[PDB]
């Protein structure tokens, strides 16, 4: 029968913009607690948003098919970045084929030379930028630079990187990104407001696609196995080749998806590990990595870093970079004793569910040894058919960075406490001006 309870609204135009914008973690716990329901509804500018904040009900968000809970309508703001006809904007079966092709480029089959590529690039960075015996750095910025540099070294052949270096790629992604209005997911009318300067999303994507076109022409001329080369062998079930427009789009998706999420996960991980109270965990990290050779390989990172993986997964559990995942409800869904109606946005919140007292007791505590106490409660990388395809690659990057950085340097946070999360950006990370750290090169 029953609609989920709606948190009381006192200003109709805005709904709960003020309280949700200011502090999503507090506000979502408040609704859940005061409405006495894991499943509840808020308003963003009048759009109903129904949140499935009971982890026992996660599968009611993650299992229904696309024609019932449809991501397309929520992510139409990405069309200028990924492209028309690409990903979400393609018919559902074709979307799935395209994403599957990109997932195959990021599985363990492709990783055998990634660890040394990552390591070589990290060391280049540290040698260029962490030069003296000690120095002060912004860690969130530097981790960001290492994430883009490493991913490019892994995924793009040398011919590509001669036309399109990591800094130039970074600039292209920044222009695509800065054009986006995250709230237009809930309030599409925001696209009608004037901008402070012209957007450059369409020009930046056109330039990327033109570079890739030119690289392809050249490769074809000289007579194969980077990301670009793999996507060029993609053939759909209808017997047609993935187009240049689509290949470009999957490449943007891949770089775009990782750039803030992996950076932030790296940064948080290092921020907890270096905090004085977490000395026991840093010691345990050293036990695990202190017997490694200078030149790490696939086995060391994939098989011999379980504790460091737990550090990374717990940093995501505590402070998930993506606070919510969303679907447009095309046909009503039953969730527990409620029915979520057609036209709602339905969402599952890693932020909310990771603070559930049953699933994660003392959830503001960073405890790499914890396990979820409700199965499937951790949803940092989603679940079901839309689960993260970049998750293995991302974890390979982060763990390689950690093993390399903490081998050569000690770190000290220049404030008393790990940063507050800054909930003001669409991908959520530690507050930037709080991420000053002092490195000290270890006696070798
Ligand atoms: O970051 C995002 N999208 C990119 C791009 C991307 C999207 N689909 C993908 C699928 C695969 C790969 C990349 C992507 C991405 O990189 N996503 C990604 C996806 C999977 N893996 C890695 C990365 C993204 C993040 C958040 C987001 N909102 C969050 C909260 N909102 C909101 C609005 C108003 C209020 C207030 F009014 F104040 F109340 C409060 C909150 C608005 C929406 C929207 C986002 F689009
Ligand atoms: C720590 C880093 C990352 C985090 C925390 C993260 C998180 C997530 C989450 C929560 C989802 C579920 C989205 C939904 O259900 O709507 C997801 C899906 C996805 N992620 Fe990531 N991700 C990360 C890194 C990456 C990387 C490096 C890629 C590179 C390709 C990527 C690509 C994707 C894609 C394509 C999906 C789509 C699944 C779909 O709709 O089929 N992610 N990710
Ligand atoms: Cl386009």
Among protein residues, the one with the nearest Cα to ligand 2's atom 3 is 261
Q: Is 338 in the pocket of ligand 2 (CB under 6 A)?
A: no
Q: Is 394 in the pocket of ligand 2 (CB under 6 A)?
A: yes
Pocket test for ligand 2, best of 227, 388, 393, 399 (most atoms within 8 A of CB): 388
Contacts of 362 (CB under 8 A, 6+ apart): none
DSSP 332-372: -EEETTEEE-TT-EEEE-HHHHTT-TTTSSSTTS--TT---
Residue 153: count of CB within 10 angstroms of its CB: 21
Handedness of CA 51, 55, 60, 66 (dihedral sign): positive
* CA atoms within 13 Å, Cβ hemisphere of 126: 21
Residue 185 DSSP label = G
Handedness of CA 47, 53, 59, 62 (dihedral sign): positive
Question: d(Cα 78, Cα 85) in Å, to the nearest integer?
Answer: 11
Determined by which method?
Answer: X-ray
Domains and CATH numbers, the chain: 1-444 (1.10.630.10)
Ligand 2 atom closest to 88 (CA): 40
Decide if 60 contacts 51 (C-beta within 8 A). no
Among protein residues, the one with the nearest Cα to ligand 1's atom 43 is 182
Decide if 242 contacts 377 (C-beta within 8 A). no
What resolution in Å is listed for this PDB structure?
A: 2.0
Relative to beta strand 345-348, strand 429-430 is unpaired
Contacts of 126 (CB under 8 A, 6+ apart): 404, 405, 408, 409
* CA atoms within 13 Å, Cβ hemisphere of 280: 5
Question: d(Cα 363, Cα 319) in Å, to the nearest integer?
Answer: 10
Decide if 111 contacts 298 (C-beta within 8 A). yes
Question: d(Cα 429, Cα 426) in Å, to the nearest integer?
Answer: 9
Question: d(Cα 269, Cα 100) in Å, to the nearest integer?
Answer: 29
Ligand 1 atom closest to 324 (CA): 29
Could you give the strand order of the β-sheet that contains 39-44, starting from the edge strand earlier in sequence? 39-44, 47-52, 345-348, 325-329, 69-70
For residue 401 the two structure tokens come to: 């960075």
Pocket test for ligand 1, best of 15, 78, 81 (most atoms within 8 A of CB): 78
Residue 30: enclosing H or E segment and its boundaries?
helix 24-34
Partners of residue 421 on adjacent β-strands: 430
Ligand 1 atom closest to 183 (CA): 33
Q: Which ligand is nearest to the CA of 399?
A: 2
Question: d(Cα 444, Cα 107) in Å, to the nearest integer?
Answer: 35
For residue 232 the two structure tokens come to: 């060029």
Centre of ligand 3 from the C-alpha of residue 177, in Å: 14
Question: d(Cα 378, Cα 15) in Å, to the nearest integer?
Answer: 29
Decide if 335 contacts 80 (C-beta within 8 A). no
- What SS3 class is residue 269? helix
Length in residues, the chain: 444
**Spatial CA neighbour of 421 closest among 435, 411, 441:** 435
Ligand 2 atom closest to 151 (CA): 27
Decide if 405 contacts 122 (C-beta within 8 A). yes
For residue 212 the two structure tokens come to: 């890739």
Residue 420 DSSP label = P
Question: d(Cα 362, Cα 354) in Å, to the nearest integer?
Answer: 10
For residue 337 the two structure tokens come to: 């004793």
DSSP 401-412: HHHHHHHHEEEE
Centre of ligand 2 from the C-alpha of residue 171, in Å: 22
Cα distances (angstroms) measured from residue 265 to each of 268, 270, 313, 314, 403? 5, 9, 9, 10, 14
Cα distances (angstroms) measured from residue 165 to each of 168, 172, 173? 5, 11, 12
Residue 439 phi, psi dihedral angles, 5° rounding: -90, 155
Buried b (16+ CB within 10 A) or exposed e, 120-151: ebbeebbeeebeeeeeebebbebbbbbbbbbb
Q: Is 396 in the pocket of ligand 2 (CB under 6 A)?
A: no
Centre of ligand 1 from the C-alpha of residue 182, in Å: 6
Q: Which ligand is nearest to the CA of 177?
A: 1
Alpha helices in 105-199 (DSSP H): 114-129, 139-155, 158-163, 166-178
Centre of ligand 1 from the C-alpha of residue 253, in Å: 13
Contacts of 424 (CB under 8 A, 6+ apart): none
Among protein residues, the one with the nearest Cα to ligand 2's atom 18 is 388
Ligand 2 atom closest to 395 (CA): 1
Question: d(Cα 251, Cα 257) in Å, to the nearest integer?
Answer: 10
Centre of ligand 2 from the C-alpha of residue 394, in Å: 10
Radius of gyration for the chain, computed over Cα atoms and rounded to the nearest angstrom? 22
DSSP 244-256: HHHHHHHHHHHHH
SS3 content of the chain, % helix, strand, coil (to 5): 55, 10, 35
Cα distances (angstroms) measured from residue 374 to each of 334, 338, 357, 359? 21, 21, 10, 5
Residue 47 phi, psi dihedral angles, 5° rounding: -75, 125
Q: Is 152 among the annotated ligand-binding positions?
A: no
For residue 189 the two structure tokens come to: 């009318």
Question: d(Cα 35, Cα 8) in Å, to the nearest integer?
Answer: 10
- By the 10 Å C-beta count (0-12 exposed, 13-18 middle, 19+ buried), 223 is classed as exposed
Question: d(Cα 57, Cα 358) in Å, to the nearest integer?
Answer: 13
Tell me how far the alpha carbon of residue 382 is from its chain's centroid. 10
């Amino acid at each position: 029968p029953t609609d989920p309870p709606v948190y009381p609204v006192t200003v109709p135009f805005l709904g709960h913009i003020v309280q949700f914008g200011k502090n999503p973690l507090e506000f979502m716990q408040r609704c859940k607690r005061d409405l006495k329901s894991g499943v509840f509804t808020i308003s963003i500018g009048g759009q109903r948003v129904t949140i499935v904040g009971d982890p026992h009900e996660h599968s009611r968000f993650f299992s229904p098919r696309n024609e019932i809970l449809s991501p397309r309508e929520v992510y139409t703001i990405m069309t200028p970045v990924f492209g028309e006809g690409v990903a979400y904007a393609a018919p559902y079966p074709r979307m799935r084929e395209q994403l599957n092709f990109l997932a195959e480029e990021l599985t363990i089959a492709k990783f055998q030379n990634f660890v040394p590529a990552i390591q070589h690039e990290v060391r280049k960075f540290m040698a260029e930028n962490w030069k003296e015996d000690e120095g002060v750095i912004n860690l969130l910025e530097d981790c960001g630079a290492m994430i883009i540099n490493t991913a490019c070294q892994c995924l793009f052949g040398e011919d590509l990187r001669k036309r399109l270096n990591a800094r130039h790629f970074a600039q292209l992604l920044s222009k695509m990104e800065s054009s986006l209005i995250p709230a237009a997911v809930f309030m599409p009318w925001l696209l009608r407001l004037p901008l402070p300067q012209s957007a450059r999303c369409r020009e930046a994507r056109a330039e990327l696609q033109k570079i890739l076109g030119e690289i392809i022409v050249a490769r074809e001329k000289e007579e194969t196995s980077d990301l670009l080369g793999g996507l060029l062998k993609a053939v759909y079930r209808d017997g047609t080749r993935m187009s240049l427009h689509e290949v470009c789009g999957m490449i943007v998706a891949a770089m775009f998806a990782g750039q803030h999420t992996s950076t932030i996960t790296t940064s948080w991980s290092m921020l907890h590990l270096m905090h004085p109270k977490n000395k026991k965990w840093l010691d345990k990290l050293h036990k695990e990595i202190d017997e490694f050779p200078a030149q790490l390989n696939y086995d060391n990172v994939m098989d011999e870093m379980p504790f460091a993986e737990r550090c990374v997964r717990e940093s995501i559990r505590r402070d998930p970079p993506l606070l919510m995942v969303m679907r447009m409800v095309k046909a009503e869904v039953k969730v527990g004793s409620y029915v979520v109606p057609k036209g709602d946005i339905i969402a599952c919140s890693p932020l909310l569910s990771h603070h559930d007292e049953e699933a994660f007791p003392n959830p503001r505590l960073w405890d790499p040894e914890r396990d979820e106490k409700v199965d499937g409660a951790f949803i940092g990388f989603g679940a079901g058919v839309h689960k993260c395809i970049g998750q293995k690659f991302a974890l390979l990057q982060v763990k390689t960075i950690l093993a390399t950085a903490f081998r050569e340097y000690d770190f000290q946070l220049l404030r008393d406490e790990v940063p507050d999360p800054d909930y003001h950006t669409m991908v959520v990370g530690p507050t930037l001006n709080q991420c000053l750290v002092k490195y000290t090169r270890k006696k070798k």
